[PDB]
């Protein structure tokens, strides 16, 4: 049990501030409030929430899922809180190791030169637009698709 009530126990998930720092960050009112919050997962991506975020008793294990080429923040709509509460708020999503498949061998294409030839970045940009997100970047070296949302 984490002194701030945060529930985050799955392998490779981490927070900024770290879960250890957050355990030392409970205030006089028993709350853990940060300015700028990241939840990440090594090998998959991360999500950055600007501004003041109340983390106390946040069930991150249930709420946040950072997968290959996709994040899920609130698995259903019934338990998604009102706009501005919890993590239903503006965020920058980064999904790492996102690379296309080479139709010849069904092998991943990681060469930046090849990724440019085929304008993969514009596939991800089209996808963002269709999802109602704002495309920010595709960094081919790390396969990092970055986009911003106003809420989840």
């Amino acid at each position, epitope marked *: 049990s984490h002194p701030a009530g945060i529930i985050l126990t799955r392998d490779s998930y981490y927070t900024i501030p770290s879960m250890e720092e957050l355990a030392r960050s409970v205030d006089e009112n028993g709350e853990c409030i940060v300015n700028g919050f990241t939840i990440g997962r090594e090998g998959f991506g991360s999500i950055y929430f600007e501004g003041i975020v109340n983390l106390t008793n946040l069930d991150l294990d249930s709420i946040v899922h950072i997968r290959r080429k996709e994040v899920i923040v609130y698995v259903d709509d019934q338990n998604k809180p009102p706009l501005g*509460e919890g993590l239903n708020r503006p965020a920058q999503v980064t999904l790492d190791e996102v690379w296309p498949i080479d139709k010849t061998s069904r092998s991943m294409i990681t060469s930046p030169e090849r990724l440019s030839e085929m304008n993969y970045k514009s596939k991800l940009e089209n996808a963002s637009r269709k999802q109602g997100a704002q495309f920010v970047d595709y960094r081919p070296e790390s396969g990092s698709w970055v986009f911003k949302v106003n809420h989840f």
Partner: nanobody
Amino acid sequence: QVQLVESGGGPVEAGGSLRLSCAASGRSFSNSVMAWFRQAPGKEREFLSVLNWSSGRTSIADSVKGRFTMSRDPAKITVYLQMNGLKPEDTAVYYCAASNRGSLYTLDNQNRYEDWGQGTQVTVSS
């Protein structure tokens, strides 16, 4: 100062069902944890169920797992205890409890919750 108001108790035939309600008010509960407990005469308070407000996830004590479930109406900031297959030993005062704080206690511990309802009597008549 937070107010927790239980309702829905009272007499019920054995084998029947009851739904308890608890309306919470006074502050935002967006980062809360809420629980149901009960206390029979001459016994310590018993943990029944907890709900995490941020996700809506719940956990039920083994003593009542398969018979009791916990849910909420987020809009009404109300939680519910659905009790089925009621038995005479379910007779008790049922309490809703809440925390808007972190804690060193586990969620099944009454000390986890700074706020408590007045309690509502449930009486299962054979």
